[PDB]
């Protein structure tokens, strides 16, 4: 297989930037969104926790995302998922609790 065990912080992705802070992405959201549904998850790899960041109608939000000493990621008010891929994709469906469902990746792109 050769593909590491746990998610090796799959930076590669828009709505998944394990670099941004929280504001940095919220200013980015400032750029894109409006349509209520834009979002971008953040998850580094060193120490701390992840957090979903989306925008409603002009009020960026953030949702702490962590597991439960079980190994699976989740959210207090949100839900419970395996990884940010499920909590994201899932939520890509609905809000599940967010202010509003998801619709688009917010964070920036790459190069050009």
């Amino acid at each position: 297989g050769s593909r590491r065990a746990s998610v090796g912080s799959h930076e590669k992705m828009p709505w998944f930037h394990g670099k941004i802070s929280r504001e940095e992405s919220e200013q980015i959201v400032l750029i894109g969104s409006k349509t209520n549904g834009k979002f971008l998850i953040r998850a580094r790899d060193n120490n701390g926790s992840y957090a979903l960041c989306l925008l409603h109608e002009g009020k960026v939000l953030h949702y702490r995302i962590d597991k439960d000493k079980t190994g699976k990621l989740s959210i207090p008010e949100g839900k419970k998922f395996d990884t940010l891929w499920q909590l994201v994709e899932h939520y890509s469906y609905k809000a599940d609790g967010l202010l509003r469902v998801l619709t688009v990746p917010c964070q920036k792109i790459g190069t050009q």
Binding site: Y63, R64, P76, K79
Partner: peptide
């Protein structure tokens, strides 16, 4: 800073 899901 975490809205309530």
């Amino acid at each position: 800073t975490y809205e309530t899901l």
